[PDB]
Design a protein around this nucleic acid. Structure first.
Ligand code: FES
Ligand code: K
Ligand code: MG
Ligand code: MG
Ligand code: MG
Lengths: 96, 137, 133, 98, 86
RNA sequence: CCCCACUAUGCUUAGCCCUAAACCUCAACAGUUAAAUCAACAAAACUGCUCGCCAGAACACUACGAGCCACAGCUUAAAACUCAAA
């Protein structure tokens, strides 16, 4: 019978979700991008539940931030005020 | 213009003024709120001490130093001696989580000074010295 | 009365053994009917088991050729603003019209998936069906 | 003689594909104060709240437009070997079918 | 020490509302984890105790989220009885 | 047990010592999910094959012998008397 079902992969399968930095290079010299994932008031690195990044890119951002901090590219105890007006990508609100 | 919670930048020119002076020229009230004492020192923007007051210098002794009322009294005394040197506006820098963290600021306000910003500078090591062992009480 | 060991054999085997053993004087009313017209499977108790390792259920996913077309249709023109009527046994959606035209062009032409899609879209627009990408 | 395979293949439900964000026409068959029980041709009915706008028009037998989200609401929970089902479909009530 | 002052952990007062600024600073320090760090650094926590505490906290969070998800999923059925009497 | 002061020690270099609830309290490889699943609990139940180990309690993480940069230290590890239990 020609009406029987046939074997194939799911054609309606939606593409797997990607993080905002998927496919993009994270450099320790790009202090602007790294500053988007630290607290404005303390400079502490945000966890993935706040940044929304995948584990690989969370690790990449963490390593880049630490490298830039120790090589004199990024402040440690606060976010550089020059980047305070950059787009907000983290899910955190201080109700300031 | 929307109020900015973030402090002004020394470099970036801003229009915020307090009695004609910029943010980086305002005197600084340093509050150290320990567990048994609160010490307040007012200094000029150039780091010239203007007034000093602690709970111990205001007569309180032993456990009475580590209360809110003692810190409030120290704040009032510091505010009076700073008013006598032309201080009106201050930037508050608080260090420590003692009982007088907020009472000292209250005393400063009741002594006549106007707080324009609050900064916390409590020492937080990134895991340096080893703390003491817990009390076995 | 019969044996109340529901986990040993079935009601039929228990009843039959008891009847032939003389415990039951007469067959129950359903015994002859069960004899004449037995079920496909004898109702014997069995304990369901959790599968482990490489064991997998033999249930297959139901897929058809046109599903691929449907999927890509639903990915390009989106879900039709028209509403499905599942109560009508012969309801014909916009996607189903697109599928039938796609298959017609496939059997009346070559096999180039992108060309078939664009040509079918042109044909539907010519017929008078709106299709917003 | 039409086989079961043909009926399944040509069924409107089969043709619909995924049920997420699909517009369907349902019929109200039961009323419980402001709870509307609607059949849309699936295995399970959906329960919607009576809209605040023209709420009097929603009566038994009324045809309504719905956006399907799930044909059956199920989910496996921690420490369970089988899914828990609420025996209900998920949908959003849009309005009355003119 | 080597950083610029009056940038980190700094809040401006709006219309003389010093209490609101202080409470906002307290919130910032709390959600940045600084308050818990300061309070936990007063006495030394042994590494085994630290690991046990973190494991307990993580699994408590996971269990609580799963329970909340289950309760919310089962909340949909809590409505007026449609077949009252039968 | 709280408070203050201050040692060995926690650190580096070159050597010892060789012990842990050194635990996933699950020996290593390969395989199975069909069976009655299965003493209990723990951590679903098993199969093939190999090595290691175990045959009542206590005496005994002991004595003696032997080995070890170890010198009342570590590894291996008994017997007599006793009991009906453990
Ligand atoms: S999901 Fe692609 S790098 Fe994160
Ligand atoms: K263990
Ligand atoms: Mg071995
Ligand atoms: Mg023995
Ligand atoms: Mg020995």
């Amino acid at each position: 019978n020609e009406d029987l079902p046939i074997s194939m992969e799911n054609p309606y399968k939606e593409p797997l979700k990607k993080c905002i930095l998927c496919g993009k290079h994270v450099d320790y010299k790009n202090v602007q991008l790294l500053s988007q994932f630290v607290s404005p008031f303390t400079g502490c690195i945000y966890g993935r539940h706040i940044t929304g990044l995948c584990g690989k890119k969370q690790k990449e951002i963490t390593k880049a931030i630490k490298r830039a901090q120790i090589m004199g590219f990024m402040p440690v105890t606060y976010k550089d005020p020059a980047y305070l007006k950059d787009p907000k990508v983290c899910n955190i609100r201080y109700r300031e | 213009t929307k109020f900015s919670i973030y402090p002004p930048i020394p470099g970036e020119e801003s229009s915020l003024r307090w009695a004609g002076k910029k943010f980086e020229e305002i005197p600084i009230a340093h509050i150290k709120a320990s567990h048994n004492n609160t010490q307040i020192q007012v200094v000029s923007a150039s780091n010239e001490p203007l007034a000093f007051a602690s709970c111990g210098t205001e007569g309180f002794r032993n456990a009475k130093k580590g209360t809110g009322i003692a810190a409030q009294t120290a704040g009032i005394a510091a505010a009076a001696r700073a008013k006598q040197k032309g201080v009106i506006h201050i930037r508050v820098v608080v260090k420590g989580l003692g009982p007088g963290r907020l009472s000292a600021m209250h005393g400063l306000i009741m002594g006549g000074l106007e707080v324009i910003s609050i900064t916390d500078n409590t020492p937080i090591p990134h895991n340096g010295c080893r703390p003491r062992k817990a009390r076995k009480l | 009365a019969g044996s109340r060991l529901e986990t040993v054999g079935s009601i039929f085997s228990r009843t039959r053994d008891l009847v032939r053993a003389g415990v039951l004087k007469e067959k129950p009313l359903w015994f002859d009917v069960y004899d004449a017209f037995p079920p496909l499977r004898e109702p014997v108790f069995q304990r369901p088991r959790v599968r482990y390792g490489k064991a997998k259920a033999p249930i297959q996913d139901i897929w058809y050729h046109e599903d691929r077309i449907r999927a890509k249709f639903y990915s390009v023109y989106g879900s039709g603003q028209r509403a499905f009527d599942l109560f009508n046994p012969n309801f014909k959606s916009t996607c189903q019209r697109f599928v039938e035209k796609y298959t017609e062009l496939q059997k009346l032409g070559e096999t180039d998936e992108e060309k078939l899609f664009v040509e079918t879209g042109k044909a539907l627009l010519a017929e008078g069906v709106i299709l917003r990408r | 003689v039409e086989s079961f395979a043909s009926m399944l293949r040509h069924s409107p439900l089969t043709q619909m594909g995924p049920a997420k964000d699909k517009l369907v026409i349902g019929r109200i068959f039961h009323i419980v104060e402001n709870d509307l029980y609607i059949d849309f041709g699936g295995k399970f009915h959906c329960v919607c709240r009576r809209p605040e706008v023209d709420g009097e028009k929603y009566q038994k037998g009324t045809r309504v437009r719905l956006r399907l989200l799930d044909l059956e609401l199920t989910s496996r929970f921690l420490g369970a070997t089988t899914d828990t089902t609420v025996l209900e479909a998920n949908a959003v009530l849009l309005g009355i079918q003119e | 020490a080597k950083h610029l002052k009056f940038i980190a952990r700094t809040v401006m007062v709006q219309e003389g509302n010093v209490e609101s600024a202080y409470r906002t600073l307290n919130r910032i320090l709390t959600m940045d984890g600084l308050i818990e760090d300061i309070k936990h650094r007063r006495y030394y926590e042994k590494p085994c105790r630290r690991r046990q505490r973190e494991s307990y906290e993580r699994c408590r969070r996971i269990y609580n989220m799963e329970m909340a998800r289950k309760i919310n999923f089962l909340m949909r059925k809590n409505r007026a009885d449609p077949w009252q009497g039968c």
